[PDB]
Design an enzyme around this catalytic site. Sequence first.
Site, PDB file in Angstrom:
ATOM      1  N   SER A 151      31.972 -29.416  41.212  1.00 32.99           N
ATOM      2  CA  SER A 151      31.061 -30.377  41.010  1.00 32.99           C
ATOM      3  C   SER A 151      31.856 -31.449  40.724  1.00 32.99           C
ATOM      4  O   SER A 151      32.304 -32.244  40.328  1.00 32.99           O
ATOM      5  CB  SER A 151      30.251 -30.088  39.974  1.00 32.99           C
ATOM      6  OG  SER A 151      29.639 -31.197  39.413  1.00 32.99           O
ATOM      7  N   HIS A 204      33.674 -19.027  26.611  1.00 40.17           N
ATOM      8  CA  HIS A 204      35.401 -19.137  25.421  1.00 40.17           C
ATOM      9  C   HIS A 204      34.995 -17.278  25.067  1.00 40.17           C
ATOM     10  O   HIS A 204      35.789 -17.005  24.310  1.00 40.17           O
ATOM     11  CB  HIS A 204      35.132 -19.853  24.426  1.00 40.17           C
ATOM     12  CG  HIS A 204      36.283 -20.045  24.282  1.00 40.17           C
ATOM     13  ND1 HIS A 204      36.706 -19.606  24.325  1.00 40.17           N
ATOM     14  CD2 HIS A 204      36.160 -21.424  22.760  1.00 40.17           C
ATOM     15  CE1 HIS A 204      38.094 -19.894  23.220  1.00 40.17           C
ATOM     16  NE2 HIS A 204      37.520 -20.938  21.706  1.00 40.17           N
ATOM     17  N   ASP A 208      39.843 -17.527  27.255  1.00 37.04           N
ATOM     18  CA  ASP A 208      40.815 -18.841  26.516  1.00 37.04           C
ATOM     19  C   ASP A 208      41.100 -19.978  26.698  1.00 37.04           C
ATOM     20  O   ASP A 208      41.179 -20.663  28.044  1.00 37.04           O
ATOM     21  CB  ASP A 208      41.704 -17.902  24.936  1.00 37.04           C
ATOM     22  CG  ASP A 208      43.296 -17.168  26.044  1.00 37.04           C
ATOM     23  OD1 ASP A 208      43.477 -18.018  27.619  1.00 37.04           O
ATOM     24  OD2 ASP A 208      43.558 -16.620  25.605  1.00 37.04           O
TER      25      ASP A 208
HETATM   26  C1  LIG Z   1      51.462 -21.722  17.981  1.00 37.53           C
HETATM   27  C2  LIG Z   1      51.892 -23.448  18.439  1.00 37.53           C
HETATM   28  C3  LIG Z   1      50.351 -24.425  17.957  1.00 37.53           C
HETATM   29  C4  LIG Z   1      52.784 -24.182  18.473  1.00 37.53           C
HETATM   30  O1  LIG Z   1      52.415 -25.369  18.740  1.00 37.53           O
HETATM   31  P1  LIG Z   1      54.597 -26.564  18.087  1.00 37.53           P
HETATM   32  O2  LIG Z   1      54.293 -26.210  16.726  1.00 37.53           O
HETATM   33  O3  LIG Z   1      53.968 -27.460  18.603  1.00 37.53           O
HETATM   34  O4  LIG Z   1      55.458 -25.816  18.372  1.00 37.53           O
HETATM   35  P2  LIG Z   1      56.136 -24.790  19.770  1.00 37.53           P
HETATM   36  O5  LIG Z   1      57.310 -23.842  19.526  1.00 37.53           O
HETATM   37  O6  LIG Z   1      55.051 -24.097  20.691  1.00 37.53           O
HETATM   38  O7  LIG Z   1      56.922 -26.345  21.358  1.00 37.53           O
HETATM   39  C5  LIG Z   1      57.487 -27.272  20.431  1.00 37.53           C
HETATM   40  C6  LIG Z   1      58.262 -27.982  21.769  1.00 37.53           C
HETATM   41  O8  LIG Z   1      57.072 -28.217  22.871  1.00 37.53           O
HETATM   42  C7  LIG Z   1      56.063 -29.885  22.531  1.00 37.53           C
HETATM   43  N1  LIG Z   1      55.455 -30.296  21.964  1.00 37.53           N
HETATM   44  C8  LIG Z   1      54.657 -29.814  21.055  1.00 37.53           C
HETATM   45  N2  LIG Z   1      52.903 -29.806  21.423  1.00 37.53           N
HETATM   46  C9  LIG Z   1      53.273 -31.003  22.229  1.00 37.53           C
HETATM   47  C10 LIG Z   1      51.900 -32.440  22.397  1.00 37.53           C
HETATM   48  N3  LIG Z   1      50.909 -32.074  22.296  1.00 37.53           N
HETATM   49  N4  LIG Z   1      52.431 -32.330  23.773  1.00 37.53           N
HETATM   50  C11 LIG Z   1      53.635 -32.616  24.146  1.00 37.53           C
HETATM   51  N5  LIG Z   1      54.348 -31.833  23.746  1.00 37.53           N
HETATM   52  C12 LIG Z   1      54.377 -30.959  23.255  1.00 37.53           C
HETATM   53  C13 LIG Z   1      57.138 -30.617  20.677  1.00 37.53           C
HETATM   54  O9  LIG Z   1      57.636 -31.300  20.984  1.00 37.53           O
HETATM   55  C14 LIG Z   1      58.265 -29.439  21.066  1.00 37.53           C
HETATM   56  O10 LIG Z   1      59.000 -29.755  22.414  1.00 37.53           O
HETATM   57  P3  LIG Z   1      60.802 -29.801  21.760  1.00 37.53           P
HETATM   58  O11 LIG Z   1      61.299 -28.577  22.223  1.00 37.53           O
HETATM   59  O12 LIG Z   1      61.103 -29.955  23.119  1.00 37.53           O
HETATM   60  O13 LIG Z   1      61.223 -30.585  21.023  1.00 37.53           O
HETATM   61  C15 LIG Z   1      51.663 -23.281  20.302  1.00 37.53           C
HETATM   62  O14 LIG Z   1      52.971 -22.426  20.701  1.00 37.53           O
HETATM   63  C16 LIG Z   1      50.504 -22.269  20.844  1.00 37.53           C
HETATM   64  O15 LIG Z   1      50.208 -21.641  20.455  1.00 37.53           O
HETATM   65  N6  LIG Z   1      49.909 -23.727  21.456  1.00 37.53           N
HETATM   66  C17 LIG Z   1      48.191 -23.365  21.600  1.00 37.53           C
HETATM   67  C18 LIG Z   1      46.972 -23.779  21.233  1.00 37.53           C
HETATM   68  C19 LIG Z   1      45.933 -22.743  22.052  1.00 37.53           C
HETATM   69  O16 LIG Z   1      46.287 -21.922  22.349  1.00 37.53           O
HETATM   70  N7  LIG Z   1      44.726 -23.712  22.112  1.00 37.53           N
HETATM   71  C20 LIG Z   1      43.621 -23.155  22.536  1.00 37.53           C
HETATM   72  C21 LIG Z   1      42.537 -22.480  20.815  1.00 37.53           C
HETATM   73  S1  LIG Z   1      41.342 -21.826  22.460  1.00 37.53           S
HETATM   74  C1  LIG Z   2      28.313 -32.185  48.444  1.00 36.65           C
HETATM   75  C2  LIG Z   2      29.396 -33.188  47.975  1.00 36.65           C
HETATM   76  C3  LIG Z   2      30.425 -32.297  46.847  1.00 36.65           C
HETATM   77  C4  LIG Z   2      30.475 -33.488  49.154  1.00 36.65           C
HETATM   78  O1  LIG Z   2      31.502 -34.256  49.077  1.00 36.65           O
HETATM   79  P1  LIG Z   2      33.086 -34.905  49.533  1.00 36.65           P
HETATM   80  O2  LIG Z   2      33.465 -33.626  49.912  1.00 36.65           O
HETATM   81  O3  LIG Z   2      33.737 -35.903  48.655  1.00 36.65           O
HETATM   82  O4  LIG Z   2      31.800 -35.621  50.969  1.00 36.65           O
HETATM   83  P2  LIG Z   2      31.187 -36.580  50.396  1.00 36.65           P
HETATM   84  O5  LIG Z   2      31.087 -37.083  52.098  1.00 36.65           O
HETATM   85  O6  LIG Z   2      29.683 -36.826  50.129  1.00 36.65           O
HETATM   86  O7  LIG Z   2      32.700 -37.743  50.569  1.00 36.65           O
HETATM   87  C5  LIG Z   2      33.299 -38.073  51.781  1.00 36.65           C
HETATM   88  C6  LIG Z   2      33.943 -39.643  50.261  1.00 36.65           C
HETATM   89  O8  LIG Z   2      33.886 -40.370  49.624  1.00 36.65           O
HETATM   90  C7  LIG Z   2      35.245 -41.000  48.716  1.00 36.65           C
HETATM   91  N1  LIG Z   2      35.224 -39.223  47.882  1.00 36.65           N
HETATM   92  C8  LIG Z   2      35.141 -38.628  47.235  1.00 36.65           C
HETATM   93  N2  LIG Z   2      35.109 -37.495  46.083  1.00 36.65           N
HETATM   94  C9  LIG Z   2      36.029 -38.509  45.294  1.00 36.65           C
HETATM   95  C10 LIG Z   2      36.204 -38.748  44.104  1.00 36.65           C
HETATM   96  N3  LIG Z   2      36.418 -38.463  43.247  1.00 36.65           N
HETATM   97  N4  LIG Z   2      36.812 -39.729  44.012  1.00 36.65           N
HETATM   98  C11 LIG Z   2      37.100 -41.023  44.919  1.00 36.65           C
HETATM   99  N5  LIG Z   2      36.019 -41.151  45.969  1.00 36.65           N
HETATM  100  C12 LIG Z   2      36.191 -39.966  46.507  1.00 36.65           C
HETATM  101  C13 LIG Z   2      36.183 -39.258  50.506  1.00 36.65           C
HETATM  102  O9  LIG Z   2      37.525 -39.956  50.189  1.00 36.65           O
HETATM  103  C14 LIG Z   2      35.373 -39.776  50.259  1.00 36.65           C
HETATM  104  O10 LIG Z   2      35.747 -41.233  51.366  1.00 36.65           O
HETATM  105  P3  LIG Z   2      35.918 -41.952  52.603  1.00 36.65           P
HETATM  106  O11 LIG Z   2      34.820 -41.350  53.687  1.00 36.65           O
HETATM  107  O12 LIG Z   2      35.458 -43.465  52.810  1.00 36.65           O
HETATM  108  O13 LIG Z   2      36.865 -41.707  52.984  1.00 36.65           O
HETATM  109  C15 LIG Z   2      29.014 -34.504  47.169  1.00 36.65           C
HETATM  110  O14 LIG Z   2      28.232 -34.816  48.639  1.00 36.65           O
HETATM  111  C16 LIG Z   2      28.288 -34.645  45.928  1.00 36.65           C
HETATM  112  O15 LIG Z   2      27.015 -33.983  46.159  1.00 36.65           O
HETATM  113  N6  LIG Z   2      28.680 -34.537  44.956  1.00 36.65           N
HETATM  114  C17 LIG Z   2      27.875 -34.626  43.500  1.00 36.65           C
HETATM  115  C18 LIG Z   2      28.008 -33.490  43.088  1.00 36.65           C
HETATM  116  C19 LIG Z   2      26.960 -33.364  41.881  1.00 36.65           C
HETATM  117  O16 LIG Z   2      25.896 -33.676  42.084  1.00 36.65           O
HETATM  118  N7  LIG Z   2      28.116 -32.580  40.468  1.00 36.65           N
HETATM  119  C20 LIG Z   2      26.816 -33.108  39.049  1.00 36.65           C
HETATM  120  C21 LIG Z   2      26.384 -31.179  39.014  1.00 36.65           C
HETATM  121  S1  LIG Z   2      24.786 -31.117  38.110  1.00 36.65           S
END
Ligand SMILES: CC(C)(COP(=O)(O)OP(=O)(O)OC[C@H]1O[C@@H](n2cnc3c(N)ncnc32)[C@H](O)[C@@H]1OP(=O)(O)O)[C@@H](O)C(=O)NCCC(=O)NCCS
Ligand SMILES: CC(C)(COP(=O)(O)OP(=O)(O)OC[C@H]1O[C@@H](n2cnc3c(N)ncnc32)[C@H](O)[C@@H]1OP(=O)(O)O)[C@@H](O)C(=O)NCCC(=O)NCCS
Lengths: 234, 234, 234, 131
Positions: A151, A204, A208
């Site tokens: 979208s 979800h 995940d």
């Molecule tokens: C278990 C978990 C939370 C542990 O995270 P953690 O304590 O940061 O440890 P990790 O070993 O995974 O990561 C460590 C490295 O990643 C980096 N990192 C961790 N979090 C970061 C963040 N949010 N932004 C940038 N870098 C990050 C850390 O700095 C560390 O970097 P380094 O090794 O270069 O010094 C993680 O591994 C994980 O599984 N994340 C997933 C969460 C998830 O699944 N969420 C969705 C739920 S629906």
């Molecule tokens: C059908 C649709 C997705 C077509 O998208 P599209 O492939 O980008 O084609 P469009 O003709 O609308 O867009 C072309 C122009 O807008 C610009 N544009 C499109 N998406 C853009 C974005 N995310 N950021 C900046 N500019 C964007 C393009 O660069 C292009 O510009 P230009 O012609 O001057 O080069 C779009 O018209 C639309 O209906 N958007 C709305 C979706 C919506 O309602 N979402 C909510 C759902 S509840």
Amino acid sequence: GKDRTEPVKGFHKAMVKTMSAALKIPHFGYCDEVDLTELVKLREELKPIAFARGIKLSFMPFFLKAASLGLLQFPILNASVDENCQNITYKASHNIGIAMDTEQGLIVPNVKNVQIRSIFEIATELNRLQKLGSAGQLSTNDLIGGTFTLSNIGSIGGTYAKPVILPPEVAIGALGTIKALPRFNEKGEVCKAQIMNVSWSADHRIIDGATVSRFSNLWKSYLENPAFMLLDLK
Amino acid sequence: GKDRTEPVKGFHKAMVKTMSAALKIPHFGYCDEVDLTELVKLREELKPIAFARGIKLSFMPFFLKAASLGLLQFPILNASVDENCQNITYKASHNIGIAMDTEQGLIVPNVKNVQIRSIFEIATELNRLQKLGSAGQLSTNDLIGGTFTLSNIGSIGGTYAKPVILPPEVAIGALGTIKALPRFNEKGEVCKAQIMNVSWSADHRIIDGATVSRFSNLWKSYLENPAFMLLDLK
Amino acid sequence: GKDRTEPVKGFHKAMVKTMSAALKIPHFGYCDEVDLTELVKLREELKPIAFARGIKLSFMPFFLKAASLGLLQFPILNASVDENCQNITYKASHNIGIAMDTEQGLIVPNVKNVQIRSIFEIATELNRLQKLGSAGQLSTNDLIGGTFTLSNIGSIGGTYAKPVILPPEVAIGALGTIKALPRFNEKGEVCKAQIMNVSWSADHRIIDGATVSRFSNLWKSYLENPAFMLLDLK
Amino acid sequence: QGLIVPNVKNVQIRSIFEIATELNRLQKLGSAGQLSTNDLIGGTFTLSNIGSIGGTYAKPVILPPEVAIGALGTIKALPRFNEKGEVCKAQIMNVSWSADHRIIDGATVSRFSNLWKSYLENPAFMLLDLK
Ligand SMILES: CC(C)(COP(=O)(O)OP(=O)(O)OC[C@H]1O[C@@H](n2cnc3c(N)ncnc32)[C@H](O)[C@@H]1OP(=O)(O)O)[C@@H](O)C(=O)NCCC(=O)NCCS
Ligand SMILES: CC(C)(COP(=O)(O)OP(=O)(O)OC[C@H]1O[C@@H](n2cnc3c(N)ncnc32)[C@H](O)[C@@H]1OP(=O)(O)O)[C@@H](O)C(=O)NCCC(=O)NCCS
Ligand SMILES: CC(C)(COP(=O)(O)OP(=O)(O)OC[C@H]1O[C@@H](n2cnc3c(N)ncnc32)[C@H](O)[C@@H]1OP(=O)(O)O)[C@@H](O)C(=O)NCCC(=O)NCCS
Ligand SMILES: CC(C)(COP(=O)(O)OP(=O)(O)OC[C@H]1O[C@@H](n2cnc3c(N)ncnc32)[C@H](O)[C@@H]1OP(=O)(O)O)[C@@H](O)C(=O)NCCC(=O)NCCS
Ligand SMILES: [Cl-]
Ligand SMILES: [Cl-]
Ligand SMILES: [Cl-]
Ligand SMILES: [Cl-]
């Protein structure tokens, strides 16, 4: 000047039933920012060639092809679940829904089998659906069998969103407006970067956050380095 | 070291009821960032003029009047739907709710008929509600009749939010904290820009993303260029 | 290929149940950005001290200790609610869930009684949990009694998220990826700031926006100004 | 052993990645003296990357019954102008094609060469039509 009550009728009834059905899905949301600078430049280079062939080439065909490449790696995002969430059907076709704004309201046709199609063909199918969509002329085939949705609200405005999944699908992405923001390059200097936000929603119950996140990273790497898409296309 | 159970009692029972009713609404979320640089300047300029008429002037009067003007173009956002969502009532009065933090804690009074009031009058009614609000003396009338809500969580904190719609309303906006960020001006130079985030939620059964994105752009265009508001007011 | 159907089995059956239960909760969402430049610096200078004691120190022990200190001030966030939200049970223990990615998917063990542990003990316990986690050897005790969850999705990617609360918990936090963004200092100069996003969801039946906001601010000030934590630690 | 010309089958359906995979297979087999009959036959067109050893231009000899061949020289860094008129480091490769003039004309080889080259100079032009 006064209050006015008015029945929900005709095609407006479908949005009601679809979004009500979506209450059954526990939505997880995950967002990121993607750096589209190389892609803006890439799209400028290809816009003429597309134009000469009669196609308007927006960003969507790229977003779509990158999505589909992501779905090859994360096929669980292109899947469906049954009434109780007992089974998942992994769907092989990438029939990717294009939510589209019309004069009559919201409609969502899809491009079939994005997995077998080039960016150019996707561009072509888009135009076709846009022309048809705005003329009230989409066929039944254009509207069914969607497996996954994008979208592009960003063609109108926005940064992040929270899009509602279309049952029976399990995920959806919303794209915000591409905007020039100040960012660091690898040296640590401040550049003009064309940044776009993305917002994914997923069921979800079976999806995940790691999955969505890795999907988004892959999707993202394709758009931040379009080269990457070249490696495996045929 | 000890767990404690406690009844939910008194006013607190109301929030339980509202937010439970809100589960029946499929929430669509849409967000954006708004450049408030000109409005901060404008407000500075009006502060002394407001003070001299015995009135505190925040941004909320600007936000409110901008929302009202938007609602005039998108009346569906000022509307209700019935139990099964089969009829829309487009409400003529813009009674815009103001989510209010008090010592007891959450309450939502509204400013009646914004569409007929000046920014100054909205400031006046806002002050009155804040006065009654923090003394616990809001009346029944100030609390009923809401058609739409704004939530200024930014007077305390935050960027984006996912606010929950107050039934039987169909939309709500939350405003984050106005923060100075590096942004580009037309000339491509890095300026100090006063950025605020807004997050809207809307009942997706009857309100699509285009409509909220457009409402949002109009509201936003009014705040980014306060001039534009001049044009049509009387 | 062709479509393939497949049963949901094994430990996947847990995520279906848990996330369905979460539909009963009206999620309020609130997000912010937090400037971790100082914490990054702090952590770098503690890494060698932790390594020398046999421990890997990420940012999580800091986030968890801050959260816990926050929950002492806003204990309604470490609480549960009954079937119909008539009574709240404030919980004394901060047993904080670590959402954790593994080969078999999402598992949520917790660190028991954070309120009585040091940053170093938390890290130790976190490490015990990572070792068991990626062995698929977590015990029942590691999995139960959780009161509050943090989800560090940023170790994989992202900015904002909309995490789903795990009943019978009432709040959850998701942390995005730490990322260098151009920001202003007090002097008004553009510099390199390590920015992280945080997204909170709370059960809006009993927890209001103001509450989450204030908690988030306190949590955030502890991370922005790590020495603020000194003050009350023993 | 000397010179050997195996081919990559059906390049038209393969991706850059698979083409590289098949090159690796052939290079390995070729240097063990194990190329098979099927690798040696059915060739339809030929590239001679002599530049992996040296050279600029060349005059490659077509292998019958094919009708064309290209040789590639060594990529080297040469002063070139960019779009502004400034002098830039440019990675330059020469290509030399030989064609059977009884049926192929010069405009054909040139137009084909222009096309090949725009794909290489502008790799994203290949993005546009791959599936
Ligand atoms: C278990 C978990 C939370 C542990 O995270 P953690 O304590 O940061 O440890 P990790 O070993 O995974 O990561 C460590 C490295 O990643 C980096 N990192 C961790 N979090 C970061 C963040 N949010 N932004 C940038 N870098 C990050 C850390 O700095 C560390 O970097 P380094 O090794 O270069 O010094 C993680 O591994 C994980 O599984 N994340 C997933 C969460 C998830 O699944 N969420 C969705 C739920 S629906
Ligand atoms: C059908 C649709 C997705 C077509 O998208 P599209 O492939 O980008 O084609 P469009 O003709 O609308 O867009 C072309 C122009 O807008 C610009 N544009 C499109 N998406 C853009 C974005 N995310 N950021 C900046 N500019 C964007 C393009 O660069 C292009 O510009 P230009 O012609 O001057 O080069 C779009 O018209 C639309 O209906 N958007 C709305 C979706 C919506 O309602 N979402 C909510 C759902 S509840
Ligand atoms: C009732 C309420 C909306 C009135 O807000 P208000 O009109 O801004 O008035 P206040 O008196 O609170 O704020 C005045 C000051 O805060 C500043 N402020 C208010 N909103 C701001 C924002 N979004 N960003 C930055 N600063 C802000 C104003 O500039 C003013 O500052 P100043 O006096 O130094 O110039 C507000 O006080 C409130 O209760 N906010 C919380 C909403 C809430 O709890 N929502 C949760 C829903 S679950
Ligand atoms: C089989 C063959 C074509 C494979 O070529 P290839 O795909 O480039 O593989 P190679 O292992 O030879 O490449 C080795 C390196 O040389 C470089 N190289 C290859 N061709 C080059 C050229 N055109 N210009 C500059 N460098 C080149 C590559 O970049 C690679 O670089 P790296 O390892 O530093 O990253 C080649 O090894 C060969 O046999 N060349 C001789 C061709 C010949 O005999 N033709 C005349 C027919 S009469
Ligand atoms: Cl939910
Ligand atoms: Cl920014
Ligand atoms: Cl929903
Ligand atoms: Cl909700």
